[PDB]
Symmetry: C3
Subunit: 79 residues, 3 copies
């Protein structure tokens, strides 16, 4: 019931943290590329597409985490 739903919620939040870690690593890559130029456009197109896909996945996982949060709260009410 409630503990089951909590465990299922943790799975989605953990996937979101993992996907956000990937997004972080992509931002680290972009910062490093620009720093090496200070001190191609196809590669940046690939960077943009990886950002888009992981951002889209994260928003999906957040939304499903939000949906499970409401199910859990309604599960707790009334019991």
């Amino acid at each position: 019931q409630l503990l089951s739903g909590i465990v299922q919620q943790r799975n989605n939040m953990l996937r979101a943290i993992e996907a956000q870690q990937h997004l972080l690593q992509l931002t680290v890559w972009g910062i490093k590329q620009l720093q090496a130029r200070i001190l191609g456009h196809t590669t940046w197109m690939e960077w943009d597409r990886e950002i888009n896909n992981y951002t889209s996945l994260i928003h999906s996982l957040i939304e499903e985490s939000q949906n499970q949060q409401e199910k859990n709260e309604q599960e707790l009410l009334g019991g």
Copy 2:
């Protein structure tokens, strides 16, 4: 009828949400730099960074306080 562990507010998911706002701000910042390197609004970006950074650290601190209360309730039997 239940333990407070299973009812407390999910500030962890709130932190995940706010960290995604920060990530998307850093993506925007990187994209602007990229457009000039390869060839005001930045105060607004700085402000938004600071606001979400302040929010996230508040959620982390509250999540840590919940964690301490969760552990103590486990110990209370």
Copy 3:
């Protein structure tokens, strides 16, 4: 009995992962600002930045992996 314990134990590692990812975020913000002040010695400082990224990335992957291990234990307990 043990499921509630495992749920609490996982929350600790997931919160630690979120904290470590926040420090990674702050490091990327630092790098973005350094490049922005340039547009609109330092080699050692950037190596120090690179070293902090690596240390926090390694910590995050460790906390994620152990959060996943506890997720599996929790799911198996439910089964």
